[PDB]
Design a protein around this ligand. Structure first.
Ligand code: NAD
Ligand code: NAD
Lengths: 308, 308
């Protein structure tokens, strides 16, 4: 069986590719290497260094390989970049998604599994925590708006053509191979600086709460979504909130760092609190996180140590 | 003379907005790629660039040179049927194009951005409350509706991020002189042209689809009122009265003196059953209400088509 993974040279995408290759699937990867890395690529997967926005190239790839599943992880996934360049962000995040969906219909993809966001989608005025999928989205960043837009388009393709889909709204994803710019980029920033004995900056009062989910658990959610959760949106998170101050403290103890953080003015657009309810994924996908924040951070620190 | 930019100014509604601004003494720049607009609609007193709103380099030149104080953004792919067949192309004009304009608007100090949106394609297919207020949760089912709603969310981002003031005008079914047969009230032009030529007229399904028909001159007045009032607000612009396709046929038959019965065709996929907009908020905050009754507006429309 052929499977297409977009964004497969990236952080989460390369872990998804590895797992699929392990399980014996034929994997085709499309990635333009804008933020992904050649070193992340699996030598067993077929690789096209192309952009998902390129209609003629996507036409070619789908026509040759007719993937039965598409795991769509390719995105401009830095919130700050989306703010500085909203049109460019949307070209990748919305238009690129639409190109893939148009080809998916034309070439009979069975199911499309979309990586979306929980933290950037619910908005800044949520009252229910941990937050369920029944809360109406109110995204405030171009990245979150783009992701929500694409979720609506997915429902259109399902209604119009019968395409099956699953949307996975990840919480803050961290672990080996992550760069410092994604939704949990702070894990990498803190880890690399602490291991190098450099100064660490915290924005505002550090009391911003996030839901940190380990990459291996996110990968498992993707694979469970192959045969379960048709035409459903799922939060993928831990339901446990951690402040930046708490995260700093945990990484400090693990790394042996012995300096205090330096507090800086708050950044624009920083949502105060994000914690996801994964009850739905538990009930319908059979998914629960297996890796505690303590264990995940130790595995992450170990990866960065080896890099040094 | 204050400079104003009107995108889509060669189109149906946009050309009337241009005429009114010129009549009121403004300097008007028009950007239109004539994909659905017509040179014969263009006001010769406006400065016309035959360009695409998605063209970042060209929009940079236009905004840099003219520094418009207001932008009336009417350029769109506005056929629902085309959006269903070509969602990626629709989104490039509707979302990416809007984002290019907004990026330039922020850079060059635009004071207010007035956006043409849609009531009918935004509220979706399961509305229970009529006439429908802006508090109704959007559930768009066509790519056009999704794109419009996405752009509304982006407008809120630019306002929060940079202090750009905006107004969103969600039109009902707009009809009148210069309309083509493809827009949301395309039926009026279709019925009128065919009745004047004594040709067969087709009614889809049972003809019981209800729409809220608003005359173009009234829509133009809402655009002008939004220059000084309604900062950062979304407004339905409609009449609050519903008309079936069968009743529209009867009215136009009477006016044109058409002497035949309609021919019924199968129902269209995705035709929402009923759309009627509550304009109370616009009445209160913009001071807007329709001045042209449906009977009066249809007569004026028939007059235009006769001459033409
Ligand atoms: N990291 C998180 O915390 C987090 C949270 C919520 C959602 N997500 C989502 O998960 C997915 C993966 O995120 P990530 O953290 O691994 O980021 P990533 O940057 O490492 O992965 C994205 C990959 O997509 C590629 N890419 C970007 N634009 C492309 C284009 N036009 N054509 C082809 N390839 C393109 C990049 O090169 C990159 O390899 C994304 O959809 C992202 O939005 C991530
Ligand atoms: N019943 C209606 O007509 C109705 C209802 C609700 C909303 N609206 C909205 O009102 C606006 C005007 O609609 P209209 O009925 O006058 O349609 P229209 O097609 O006559 O006007 C649109 C204009 O935009 C131009 N255009 C399209 N793509 C462009 C691009 N990439 N760059 C520059 N110009 C481009 C077209 O050439 C055209 O002249 C649209 O935003 C539409 O969505 C219309």
């Amino acid at each position: 069986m052929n499977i297409l993974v977009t964004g497969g040279a990236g952080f989460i995408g390369s872990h998804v590719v590895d797992k699929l290759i392990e399980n014996g699937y034929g994997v085709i990867v499309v990635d333009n290497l804008s933020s992904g890395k050649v070193e992340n690529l699996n030598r067993n997967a077929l690789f096209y260094e192309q952009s998902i926005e390129d209609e003629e190239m996507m036409e070619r790839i789908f026509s040759l390989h007719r993937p039965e599943y598409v795991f769509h992880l390719a995105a401009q996934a830095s919130v700050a970049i989306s703010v500085r360049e909203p049109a460019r962000d949307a070209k990748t995040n919305i238009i690129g998604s639409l190109v893939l969906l148009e080809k998916s219909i034309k070439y009979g993809v069975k199911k499309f599994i979309f990586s979306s966001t929980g933290g950037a989608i619910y908005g800044e005025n949520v009252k229910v925590f941990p937050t369920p999928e029944t809360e109406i989205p109110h995204p405030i960043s171009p990245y979150g708006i783009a992701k929500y837009s694409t979720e609506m388009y997915l429902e259109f393709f399902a209604r119009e053509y019968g395409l099956k889909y699953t949307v996975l709204r990840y919480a803050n994803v961290y672990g080996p191979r992550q760069d410092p710019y994604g939704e949990a980029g702070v894990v990498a920033i803190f880890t690399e600086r602490m291991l190098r004995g450099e100064e660490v900056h915290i924005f505002g009062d550090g009391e911003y709460v996030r839901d940190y989910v380990y990459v291996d658990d996110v990968v498992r959610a993707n694979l469970l979504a192959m045969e379960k959760g048709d035409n459903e949106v799922f939060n993928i998170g831990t339901g446990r909130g951690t402040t930046v101050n708490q995260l700093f403290k945990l990484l400090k103890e693990i790394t042996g760092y012995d300096k205090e953080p330096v507090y800086k003015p708050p950044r624009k657009g920083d949502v105060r609190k994000s914690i996801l309810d994964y009850t739905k994924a538990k009930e319908k996908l059979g998914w629960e996180p297996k890796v505690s924040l303590e264990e995940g951070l130790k595995l992450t620190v170990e990866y960065f140590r080896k890099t040094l």
